[PDB]
Amino acid sequence: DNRYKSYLEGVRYNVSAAIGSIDKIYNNYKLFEEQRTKMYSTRLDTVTKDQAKKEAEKFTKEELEKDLKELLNYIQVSAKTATNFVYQKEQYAKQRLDKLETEVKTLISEVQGQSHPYEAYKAIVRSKFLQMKDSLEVVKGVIDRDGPWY
């Protein structure tokens, strides 16, 4: 019905948003790591090291924690709406979102434990983080299709 379409539209919206968060954090980590390496390089001059230090100092622990909180919020709202997908073609999305919610809660718990930006990033971009985009893309494929599942 039209109510079900509204549920699909909202989950699609939030899962896309979550994937944006996953892409943002990972890329922020990559850039942070690149700039940190430069800033401590033995083969680079002070001008270059200085610029790297300035770019590295922008990656705060607070931005990461807020990014993970945003990610959790999009996923947890989606998981609740996805109860409606039980016994429907999109059902597989419900279990995957519940499990992602649990996993992102763990990452937030990790980031709080750490005090410095680089170590917080290093603690959270590991095995389970690095499968999250793939899992959300599985969800996306379940909830937003333009033809059969081949």
Numbering used by the authors: 222 to 371
Which sentences did the original study use to describe this structure?
B. miyamotoi encodes two separate bbk32 orthologs denoted fbpA and fbpB; however, the activities of these proteins are unknown. FbpA and FbpB both bind human complement C1r and protect a serum-sensitive B. burgdorferi strain from complement-mediated killing, but surprisingly, differ in their ability to recognize activated C1r versus zymogen states of C1r. To better understand the observed differences in C1r recognition and inhibition properties, high-resolution X-ray crystallography structures were solved of the C1r-binding regions of B. miyamotoi FbpA and FbpB at 1.9Å and 2.1Å, respectively.
A structural overlay of FbpA-C, FbpB-Δ5C, and BBK32-C shows that the three proteins retain an overall similar structure around the conserved R248 residue (BBK32 numbering). In FbpA-C, the kinked portion of alpha helix 5 extends one turn longer than in BBK32, resulting in FbpA-C containing an additional surface-exposed residue on this helix. Each of these key residues are conserved in FbpA (i.e., R264 and K343), whereas in FbpB, only the arginine is conserved (i.e., R309). SPR binding assays showed that FbpA-C and FbpB-C bound with high affinity to C1r-CCP2-SP with K D = 0.90 nM and 1.4 nM, respectively, whereas FbpA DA-C exhibited no detectable C1r-CCP2-SP binding. As expected, in light of the C1r-CCP2-SP binding data, FbpA-C demonstrated potent inhibition of classical pathway-mediated complement activation (IC50 = 23 nM), whereas the FbpA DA-C mutant lost all inhibitory activity. Interestingly, while FbpA-C was able to bind to both zymogen and active forms of C1r readily (C1r zymogen K D = 0.85 ± 0.036 nM, active C1r K D = 0.39 ± 0.049 nM), FbpB selectively interacted with active C1r only (active C1r K D= 1.1 ± 0.042 nM). We found that B. miyamotoi strain FR64b FbpA exhibits similar activity to BBK32 for both fibronectin-binding and C1r-binding/inhibition. Similar to what has been proposed for B. burgdorferi BBK32, the anti-C1r activity found here for FbpA may selectively protect B. miyamotoi from CP-mediated complement killing.
